[PDB]
Amino acid sequence: PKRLYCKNGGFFLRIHPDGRVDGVREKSDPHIKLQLQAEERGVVSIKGVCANRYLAMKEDGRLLASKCVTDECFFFERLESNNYNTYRSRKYTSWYVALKRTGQYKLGSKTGPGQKAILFLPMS
Ligand SMILES: O=[Se](=O)([O-])[O-]
Ligand SMILES: O=[Se](=O)([O-])[O-]
């Protein structure tokens, strides 16, 4: 039952009950309480405990939380050499889950390696 914490400005990923995703800096916020369920080695599912919705990635780089379980609910997780974690799309091979430093998620299509934006540290 972890929260994820962005390197890019220190925001936790927030999942809204309506599907909308973003960041906030309030650890006490309930919509930041996640469930990361590993499904194979290195492949996880991050779900919103409260929202009861799964993080999904859309064809256009779009990030949102859906009820439905599909192959877009999936992310190869990864411990970076710097000890931050990364979730890149199992479907959209090149796409990473990311938060802009202002707090809005960043288009998957505009991510890539080397970005702070992509850098997460999960916590209980
Ligand atoms: O982190 Se950001 O907003 O893409 O510069
Ligand atoms: O300004 Se920064 O460190 O490249 O995100």
Counting from 1 in the atom list of ligand 1, the atom nearest the Cα of 106 is 4
- CA atoms of 57 and 47, how far apart (whole Å): 13
- CA atoms of 45 and 56, how far apart (whole Å): 9
Structure tokens at 42: 């290195």
- CA atoms of 123 and 2, how far apart (whole Å): 5
Residues 74-110: b if buried by 16+ CB within 10 A, e if exposed: bbebbeeeeebbbbbbbbbeebbbbbbeeeebbebee
Phi, psi of 30 (to 5 degrees): -75, -35
- Cβ atoms of residues 75 and 89 within 8 Å: yes
Q: Tell me: is residue 83 an annotated ligand-binding position.
A: no
Q: Which domain holds residue 98?
A: 1-124
* Ligand found nearest the CA of 98: 1
Given 3-state DSSP classes, what are the helix, strand and coil percentages for the chain, each rounded to the nearest 5? 5, 35, 60
Structure tokens at 102: 């202002």
Q: What is the CATH number of the domain that holds 114?
A: 2.80.10.50
Q: What is the resolution of this structure in A?
A: 2.2
Closest CA to ligand 1's atom 4: 100
Closest CA to ligand 1's atom 2: 100
Experimental technique, in short, is X-ray
Per the structure, the count of domains in the chain is 1
- Cβ atoms of residues 71 and 56 within 8 Å: no
Structure tokens at 80: 């970076």
